[PDB]
Design a binder for this molecule. Sequence first.
Ligand SMILES: [Mg+2]
Ligand SMILES: [Mg+2]
Ligand SMILES: [Mg+2]
Ligand SMILES: [Mg+2]
Ligand SMILES: [Mg+2]
Ligand SMILES: [Mg+2]
Ligand SMILES: [Mg+2]
Ligand SMILES: [Mg+2]
Ligand SMILES: [Mg+2]
Ligand SMILES: [Mg+2]
Ligand SMILES: [Mg+2]
Ligand SMILES: [Mg+2]
Ligand SMILES: [Mg+2]
Ligand SMILES: [Mg+2]
Ligand SMILES: [Mg+2]
Ligand SMILES: [Mg+2]
Ligand SMILES: [Mg+2]
Ligand SMILES: [Mg+2]
Ligand SMILES: [Mg+2]
Ligand SMILES: [Mg+2]
Ligand SMILES: [Mg+2]
Ligand SMILES: [Mg+2]
Ligand SMILES: [Mg+2]
Ligand SMILES: [Mg+2]
Ligand SMILES: [Mg+2]
Ligand SMILES: [Mg+2]
Ligand SMILES: [Mg+2]
Ligand SMILES: [Mg+2]
Ligand SMILES: [Mg+2]
Ligand SMILES: [Mg+2]
Ligand SMILES: [Mg+2]
Ligand SMILES: [Mg+2]
Ligand SMILES: [Mg+2]
Ligand SMILES: [Mg+2]
Ligand SMILES: [Mg+2]
Ligand SMILES: [Mg+2]
Ligand SMILES: [Mg+2]
Ligand SMILES: [Mg+2]
Ligand SMILES: [Mg+2]
Ligand SMILES: [Mg+2]
Ligand SMILES: [Mg+2]
Ligand SMILES: [Mg+2]
Ligand SMILES: [Mg+2]
Ligand SMILES: [Mg+2]
Ligand SMILES: [Mg+2]
Ligand SMILES: [Mg+2]
Ligand SMILES: [Mg+2]
Ligand SMILES: [Mg+2]
Ligand SMILES: [Mg+2]
Ligand SMILES: [Mg+2]
Ligand SMILES: [Mg+2]
Ligand SMILES: [Mg+2]
Ligand SMILES: [Mg+2]
Ligand SMILES: [Mg+2]
Ligand SMILES: [Mg+2]
Ligand SMILES: [Mg+2]
Ligand SMILES: [Mg+2]
Ligand SMILES: [Mg+2]
Ligand SMILES: [Mg+2]
Ligand SMILES: [Mg+2]
Ligand SMILES: [Mg+2]
Ligand SMILES: [Mg+2]
Lengths: 127, 197, 96, 172, 49, 106
Amino acid sequence: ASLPHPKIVKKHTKKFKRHHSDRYHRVAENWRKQKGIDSVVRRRFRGNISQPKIGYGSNKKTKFLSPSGHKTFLVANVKDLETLTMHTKTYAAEIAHNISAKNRVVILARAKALGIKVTNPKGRLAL
Amino acid sequence: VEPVVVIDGKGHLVGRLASVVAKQLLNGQKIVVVRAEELNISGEFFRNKLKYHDFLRKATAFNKTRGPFHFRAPSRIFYKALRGMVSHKTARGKAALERLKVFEGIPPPYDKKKRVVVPQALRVLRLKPGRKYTTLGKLSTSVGWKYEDVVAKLEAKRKVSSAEYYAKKRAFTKKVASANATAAESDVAKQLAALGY
Amino acid sequence: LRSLTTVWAEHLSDEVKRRFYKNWYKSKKKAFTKYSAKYAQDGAGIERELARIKKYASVVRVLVHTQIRKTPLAQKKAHLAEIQLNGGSISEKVDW
Amino acid sequence: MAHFKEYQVIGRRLPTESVPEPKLFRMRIFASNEVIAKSRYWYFLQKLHKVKKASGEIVSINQINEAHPTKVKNFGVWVRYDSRSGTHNMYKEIRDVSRVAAVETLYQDMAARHRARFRSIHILKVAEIEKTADVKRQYVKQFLTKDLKFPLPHRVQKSTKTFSYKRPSTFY
Amino acid sequence: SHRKYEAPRHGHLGFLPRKRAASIRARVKAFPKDDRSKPVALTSFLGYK
Amino acid sequence: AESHRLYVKGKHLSYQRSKRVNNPNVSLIKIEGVATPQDAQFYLGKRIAYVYRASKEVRGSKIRVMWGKVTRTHGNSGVVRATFRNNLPAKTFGASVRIFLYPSNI
RNA sequence: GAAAUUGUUGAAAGGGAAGGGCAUUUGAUCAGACA
RNA sequence: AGAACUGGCGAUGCGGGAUGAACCGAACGUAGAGUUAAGGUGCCGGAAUACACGCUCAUCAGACACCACAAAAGGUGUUAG
RNA sequence: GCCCUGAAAAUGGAUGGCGCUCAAGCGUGUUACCUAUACUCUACCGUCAGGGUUGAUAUGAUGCCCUGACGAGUAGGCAGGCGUGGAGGUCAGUGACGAAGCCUAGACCGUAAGGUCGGGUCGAACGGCCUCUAGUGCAGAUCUUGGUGGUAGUAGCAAAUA
RNA sequence: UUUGCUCCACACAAUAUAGAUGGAUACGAAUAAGGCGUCCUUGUGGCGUCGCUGAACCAUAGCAGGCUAGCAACGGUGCACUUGGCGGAAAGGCCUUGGGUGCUUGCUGGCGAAUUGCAAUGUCAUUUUGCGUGGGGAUAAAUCAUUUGUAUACGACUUAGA
Ligand SMILES: [Mg+2]
Ligand SMILES: [Mg+2]
Ligand SMILES: [Mg+2]
Ligand SMILES: [Mg+2]
Ligand SMILES: [Mg+2]
Ligand SMILES: [Mg+2]
Ligand SMILES: [Mg+2]
Ligand SMILES: [Mg+2]
Ligand SMILES: [Mg+2]
Ligand SMILES: [Mg+2]
Ligand SMILES: [Mg+2]
Ligand SMILES: [Mg+2]
Ligand SMILES: [Mg+2]
Ligand SMILES: [Mg+2]
Ligand SMILES: [Mg+2]
Ligand SMILES: [Mg+2]
Ligand SMILES: [Mg+2]
Ligand SMILES: [Mg+2]
Ligand SMILES: [Mg+2]
Ligand SMILES: [Mg+2]
Ligand SMILES: [Mg+2]
Ligand SMILES: [Mg+2]
Ligand SMILES: [Mg+2]
Ligand SMILES: [Mg+2]
Ligand SMILES: [Mg+2]
Ligand SMILES: [Mg+2]
Ligand SMILES: [Mg+2]
Ligand SMILES: [Mg+2]
Ligand SMILES: [Mg+2]
Ligand SMILES: [Mg+2]
Ligand SMILES: [Mg+2]
Ligand SMILES: [Mg+2]
Ligand SMILES: [Mg+2]
Ligand SMILES: [Mg+2]
Ligand SMILES: [Mg+2]
Ligand SMILES: [Mg+2]
Ligand SMILES: [Mg+2]
Ligand SMILES: [Mg+2]
Ligand SMILES: [Mg+2]
Ligand SMILES: [Mg+2]
Ligand SMILES: [Mg+2]
Ligand SMILES: [Mg+2]
Ligand SMILES: [Mg+2]
Ligand SMILES: [Mg+2]
Ligand SMILES: [Mg+2]
Ligand SMILES: [Mg+2]
Ligand SMILES: [Mg+2]
Ligand SMILES: [Mg+2]
Ligand SMILES: [Mg+2]
Ligand SMILES: [Mg+2]
Ligand SMILES: [Mg+2]
Ligand SMILES: [Mg+2]
Ligand SMILES: [Mg+2]
Ligand SMILES: [Mg+2]
Ligand SMILES: [Mg+2]
Ligand SMILES: [Mg+2]
Ligand SMILES: [Mg+2]
Ligand SMILES: [Mg+2]
Ligand SMILES: [Mg+2]
Ligand SMILES: [Mg+2]
Ligand SMILES: [Mg+2]
Ligand SMILES: [Mg+2]
């Protein structure tokens, strides 16, 4: 359904994991810049891992766009859903995770009526 | 070009035959080297006797096993010669070396196969005449190789059964050329003649 | 050097047959029975085998074995071994 | 240096008010390009006159093409050079087709027989040996004898395939 | 440093290794020369000390 | 006939590389019987296919191909740089690649 | 009822450590997208 | 061990010098293409077993700045003077 | 000039290795070729700068739009942000038709800190946005307390007569 | 231990592949010398010839090569067979006889081919294994335990037991 847009180029799709996150259990993959003096990573000796930096920043056009083309949006009831009433080619609706079973089925229903996208439409669906 | 390429070693210089056998090998051309003992090395036989004895002392001190191994047969004096020019520790490396065989003399399969030369390692061409140089088998025999007498014995025997081969051949290709000239001057022949044959 | 063939006799003392085993008493002692065959037919195969040796064979050795039974040992299992032959002409050798 | 041209370079001290029309001096100069040549001019003339380019002026630079460029000639070369200990004077004879062809194989045979590099060398005079038997060094004389002939044995075909299937032959 | 008093080593490296042998029947590592001109006969024999 | 070949045989030599950093986005090709950079300028552009097999039948076959194009001459000996759709798998170094006669100019 | 750490099952690799970077073959697995 | 001017290293990766704080080259946002620096091109290794003219045969040859050494003195070895 | 003599050290061994002798050595000349995070052109990101534009009747004025240059970094400064415990206002937010938590080489957004969903397990609570507040972020500190390994089914279990 | 094994044949099914795609095309020796033809007195011989690259040689036309007729030859060649011989360096290959049979593009004919839509490798090699079939052929051992002491820390070794 999506609004037309450039080919989305992603610039660095791999996840930037922390230095030595792989080494000791206690170090979480969670990125963290190294402050050492001798740190081969910090100095950027060739062959160690790559560090997040602003050149890696995505294109100001395709930024945020998921595959479809729609900038997504957490939705929790129907009124929330309706904020997308006039932008079904720009935003999609992502039903919140806490949203009950029976409530989702209304929200979906209205999404269909309004013509609004729903990303996670099999969420707690009786089947 | 060919599936396999047999190289008569005779009159080739160790380090050059190597260098080329290396690259034939790394670009995936299966190569086998024969008559390895009849191989040459720059320098009078004695200098190369020496050079080899220096190679001989190099051995792991605490255990003469795990250290350098000293191979005597001319084929393997050639194989070392060759292994040095190959990234032999890597995959890629073992890969190539597998596509190679080195032989003193000319054993079965290979003696009925034709075998080629590598003009850029041919000694007679390469070396300056009057330079002193060195045969492998004689260098190898002087450093503990046990099998020179035997080799040149079978060789002499093989070199006989294959003169007969060539004799027979030379007579057949006489009739062949004899027959190919009773065809001379005829129409078809004059036609090919004109298309360059 | 490389073993090109052996050629064995026809009958074989249980003394040497013993050697080719580890649990004799139990086994069926089939050792050297299909070999003992090849004599049945005239000889033929045994012939060429010997004949092969002569044509080639640069050296020749005998397969002998101790008659351990005559020795006061308790062993039974006799001792088999190769022995070089150092007399004239390989062809004369195999005949011997 | 490269492949040499020969140059007539010409210059003169600048006009003074009291000395207009200075005396003008030339050199034949052996250089690979006109720039190196104008350099050498000053290099040498400064070793000879109260001048330096700053107080001087180039007046003409022209190339000098071989008299009879396909006439084999017998050159006698005179050279000052610098070894590792002292400086030195040499005469060598060179047989070749032009002054410009020789003066390269000169510089070459200095580079190789005495490891004298360009900077280290002064071409004092290159001049043709007119009448033979005034060839005095012998490796040239060796080539003046009548009905000279010589063969070129042990001939080498430079193979163009990695492998070959003959086994060659050095006949010629 | 260096020794103090040189004295000859122990043992004989020619007999290494000093493992158990790989069979009770030591091996005839070599045989007499051959002169094919004498009569043919054996070159050894089997025994019991 | 016996022959069905409509391409030239080529080996897959190296990646384009420095002395000690290689660059998989460009593969270097040895075209048979092409041994000078001039003899090589003929093949510039001619699409390259590297055929190979696998265990899983796919779109009906047990044969897949990666596809490329000769793009320039390499050095002084008719070696040749090519780029493919996906880069070539380095196990293929010294394997057989096929160079075609299209898009031709004769 | 997390982690360290352990048992079973399933898959994979391992010629004197293991882990990592760029790239791609292979297997497994997955989104989106068509209309 | 100590001063002067500058350029660096420290705080700095990238290419070359096999290796290396200080040398050569060049200073970094993420990338495509082209071309180069210094340094290379028998094979390891991308790239001429290219072209040319000499010199050198070492029973301890020689093989590239910083750089990982050698001198006096000698040779009827051989080269050009 | 090159080559030889002069030229003696301790684990086995280094023109970087193989190896090379009309060289793959020494000197010198000519061309071609190889490849840096440098140079040229283009795309994207960010930074700084210079212009444009409040005119309604629609959606950001700290905005919207054109354009040019630039981008290393320890100690250190500043900036814009991410995340936690509680507080004011709000969404008449979420939820026993399943809140919080936890597992999950399953999905997506971000350069990143982190954010969102799916499935599973679970059982009573809990979020978004504008503000407020601080006992507010861990890999270290021979760090505190607890818990757990490799060592390892190992050292051992042998004095005092049986 | 539920009909298990092996060699020859096909059948399905897997699984692999350092990388088929006309042919690895056989003297030896010399290199300041040789190859070949030829004559002879058979020699370190006479005469001639060639080289200067395999850019050769051989093969190569037919639905990835279908279905057919005929002439000329009496040749080639593929296959299963049979005769005699050779080859141990790793021989596992070479050669030769004789029938049978397919093909022959040596030459002349009849027919087919599209619609894979303008390219998409457009699939034709050989790897190892497993499951049933039926055509020959074959009916053992080793280990634990016990035991000896030519051996031994334990394993191991060396004996013995229908
Ligand atoms: Mg530091
Ligand atoms: Mg440190
Ligand atoms: Mg560090
Ligand atoms: Mg999104
Ligand atoms: Mg590899
Ligand atoms: Mg040959
Ligand atoms: Mg000679
Ligand atoms: Mg046999
Ligand atoms: Mg007794
Ligand atoms: Mg000058
Ligand atoms: Mg002492
Ligand atoms: Mg519980
Ligand atoms: Mg691994
Ligand atoms: Mg990857
Ligand atoms: Mg400086
Ligand atoms: Mg400091
Ligand atoms: Mg600094
Ligand atoms: Mg720097
Ligand atoms: Mg450099
Ligand atoms: Mg160095
Ligand atoms: Mg400088
Ligand atoms: Mg190497
Ligand atoms: Mg290369
Ligand atoms: Mg030396
Ligand atoms: Mg040396
Ligand atoms: Mg110097
Ligand atoms: Mg010299
Ligand atoms: Mg070293
Ligand atoms: Mg040295
Ligand atoms: Mg070199
Ligand atoms: Mg030069
Ligand atoms: Mg040079
Ligand atoms: Mg130049
Ligand atoms: Mg050129
Ligand atoms: Mg760089
Ligand atoms: Mg860049
Ligand atoms: Mg730019
Ligand atoms: Mg910065
Ligand atoms: Mg809060
Ligand atoms: Mg608190
Ligand atoms: Mg839940
Ligand atoms: Mg659930
Ligand atoms: Mg409760
Ligand atoms: Mg605190
Ligand atoms: Mg607290
Ligand atoms: Mg902690
Ligand atoms: Mg810690
Ligand atoms: Mg414990
Ligand atoms: Mg226990
Ligand atoms: Mg114990
Ligand atoms: Mg105790
Ligand atoms: Mg059964
Ligand atoms: Mg002959
Ligand atoms: Mg006669
Ligand atoms: Mg004759
Ligand atoms: Mg031919
Ligand atoms: Mg037809
Ligand atoms: Mg046909
Ligand atoms: Mg073989
Ligand atoms: Mg045909
Ligand atoms: Mg097919
Ligand atoms: Mg019984």
